[PDB]
Design a protein around this ligand. Structure first.
Ligand SMILES: Cc1cc2nc3c(=O)[nH]c(=O)nc-3n(C[C@H](O)[C@H](O)[C@H](O)COP(=O)(O)OP(=O)(O)OC[C@H]3O[C@@H](n4cnc5c(N)ncnc54)[C@H](O)[C@@H]3O)c2cc1C
Ligand SMILES: Cc1cc2nc3c(=O)[nH]c(=O)nc-3n(C[C@H](O)[C@H](O)[C@H](O)COP(=O)(O)OP(=O)(O)OC[C@H]3O[C@@H](n4cnc5c(N)ncnc54)[C@H](O)[C@@H]3O)c2cc1C
Ligand SMILES: O=C(O)c1cc2occ(/C=C\c3ccccc3)c2[nH]1
Ligand SMILES: O=C(O)c1cc2occ(/C=C\c3ccccc3)c2[nH]1
Lengths: 338, 338
């Protein structure tokens, strides 16, 4: 009853945790190990600020919307436990700014105290004339990945460092079910033209007076290409860069100036704030999340493969709904045994 | 044309700054010096978290309400300058919790995005069933007193350390107009039975995930005697102690337990947070602020005295409206010269 999960990001770790707590009981003996090329603090998850917020128009797959809601409710039911600081979970309020009047989002009632910005609040941001204010959650990837690792290590889950070159290679090794949580690199295991890197560059600035998140939006520049400021526990994330098809895991100077001159137009207080770090990541951009069960009859035996990747810029927002759905698929393989 | 301001708190410093910028011009040669027993970080102002919020029912003096509004507008017009971090000025959102439904405050439209808490937000605080959410400002006393000191030193304002024993003593020294900004100690210069110490004890805790202020209210325990959590730039202020008539400038253990067991019932995450410090202060409690002009014909000449003290637990909230009003009184003495 052995199962291998490939990848140690928010997807691989929550999926591995979900499957356990759903199939661990005496009658069902379960063996699980995780294979990953990179672990915390070197994953994409470690680069993500952790703000809960879906993509903000009607999703192409209505499933996703419920998975986002499932994640929020799960996280909000945790936000006030003394252990919440170990997963880097806290409550944050903030602004979402626009140039034109857009309809209220689907997640309007998922979030806390959602409302439309007043003219006086809008007068604090002089390039934007419409907007929202609401209370969400930040789930810092660094702390959450440590929490999941701890949680998995005490429940008997072994961890291994290796770069998998094919599913057939891990199938001949022993594993019954393979859980594919490779993120942006899934293509190297099974070609996927739909999956593309959504290059992001961030700036980690020391600004503790910064108490709210500010997200800006314009259909002109596109998604994730507009200034954003996201306070964390130890620093403030300064972003607003999205380059599709870009595989450069190198910090670019032109992007630094774009983020800096954009965030300082929002919060001019940021001009006299020290920079602790700059980092780069690739959002696993896919039109839809691939959360489908696939029988790999092309290789060792009739091996089952659970695909779970392509969560773009909302991996931390959606992860739990996915992890539950993946566990549901694992149960379908189990009931269809013999 | 020499004038002495007694006290270096938020009152003494803003008053001294206001008078200058209102009477500094070539035609009006002005000499001003400040006398104080204690300077930053040893004043009451240094103990105050700096949250802008008036006392929250209809004030006995409707003047005060406009002075509070004058302070907010002045501070909000500054909040987005790159210099705002030097006066410890930033924008903060938060909760005001209640056991019963109370009417909305006077300052409801003075603050940003004021609204009444939703049932789901109220379900995060299980001892309180009504409440408000709004966006205010924090003006940290430590940084603001440094900013004022800097501002005054470059405009030619001399500072002196001395404990004044009487107004007649400073009148024989030379000073034409005396500005009395002694706070809780005003009684030692001119007896005031109305002025009393409103003992406060605070706890400075390291909790950066704490992004909102939480103020609790009950008519049972009284004003300032209910748990409060106020995030600052470098730490989080944990309070909820008010002892009228208490002159003990010593941290009490029983009060520590009261604050700790109260703040942890609100935010249980605070249980595993380090304590950087504990401090004590005395709110200059008076039924009304004494901002009256008084001719001291009892002593050297017909010396004029500007009284400006008794700002209780809202000194940082009101200071600017007071400083402007005091400057207005200084102008009345000037026009009534000869
Ligand atoms: C700059 C930036 C900011 C972001 N901010 C947010 C945010 O605020 N809110 C939000 O909800 N989301 C955010 N995201 C998106 C979020 O980071 C992701 O969607 C999520 O982290 C994707 O993680 P994953 O777990 O799928 O992939 P990853 O975190 O990259 O982890 C993938 C795992 O797959 C492994 N892997 C790949 N190929 C192999 C192989 N052959 N063998 C072994 N292991 C392999 C890696 O080794 C790794 O362990 C942000 C992303 C970026 C880039
Ligand atoms: C625990 C606590 C928390 C608080 N939090 C807030 C808050 O969040 N928001 C808010 O708006 N307000 C708050 N306050 C209230 C605020 O601190 C005060 O109302 C304000 O700081 C009062 O300052 P002052 O300038 O009148 O007096 P102080 O700051 O005490 O300064 C008085 C000055 O008078 C001097 N002085 C007195 N006698 C003499 C003498 N004979 N000779 C020379 N100098 C003399 C002292 O030396 C000193 O320099 C808080 C108070 C406490 C105690
Ligand atoms: O750049 C990103 O990938 C990113 C940063 C960030 O902070 C919250 C989210 C999730 C969705 C989102 C992002 C920007 C604008 C609207 C929704 C998010 N995505
Ligand atoms: O204890 C205090 O003196 C105090 C702390 C604090 O934080 C904001 C204010 C100003 C008025 C106030 C205080 C508590 C409840 C309602 C209004 C304030 N006063």
């Amino acid at each position: 009853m052995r199962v291998v999960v490939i990848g140690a990001g928010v997807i691989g770790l929550s999926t591995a945790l979900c499957i356990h707590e759903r199939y661990h009981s005496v009658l069902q003996p379960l063996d699980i190990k995780v294979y990953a090329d990179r672990f915390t603090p070197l994953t994409t998850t470690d680069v993500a600020a952790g703000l809960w917020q879906p993509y903000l128009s009607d999703p192409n797959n209505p499933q996703e919307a419920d998975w986002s809601q499932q994640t929020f409710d799960y996280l909000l039911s945790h936000v006030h436990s003394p252990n919440a600081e170990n997963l880097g979970l806290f409550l944050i309020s903030g602004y979402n700014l626009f140039h034109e009047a857009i309809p209220d989002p689907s997640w309007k009632d998922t979030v806390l105290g959602f409302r439309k910005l007043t003219p006086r609040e809008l007068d604090m941001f002089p390039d934007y004339g419409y907007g929202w204010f609401h209370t969400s959650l930040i789930l810092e990837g660094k702390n959450y990945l440590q929490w999941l690792t701890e949680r998995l290590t005490e429940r008997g889950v072994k961890f291994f460092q290796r770069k998998v070159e094919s599913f057939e290679e891990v199938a001949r090794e022993g594993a019954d079910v393979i859980v594919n949580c490779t993120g942006v690199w899934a293509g190297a295991l099974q070609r996927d033209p739909l999956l593309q890197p959504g290059r992001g560059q961030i700036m980690k600035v020391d600004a503790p007076w910064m108490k709210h998140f500010i997200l800006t939006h314009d259909p002109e520049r596109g998604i994730y290409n507009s200034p954003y400021i996201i306070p964390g526990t130890q620093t403030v994330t300064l972003g607003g860069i999205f380059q599709l098809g870009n595989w450069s895991e190198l910090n670019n100077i032109q992007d630094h100036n774009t983020i800096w001159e954009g965030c300082c137009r929002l919060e001019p207080t940021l001009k006299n704030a020290r920079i602790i770090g700059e980092r780069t990541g690739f959002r696993p951009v896919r039109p839809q999340i691939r959360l489908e069960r696939e029988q790999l009859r092309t290789g060792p035996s009739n091996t089952e493969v659970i695909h779970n990747y392509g969560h773009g810029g909302y991996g931390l927002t959606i992860h739990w709904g996915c992890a539950l759905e993946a566990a549901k698929l694992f149960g379908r393989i189990l009931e269809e045994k013999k």
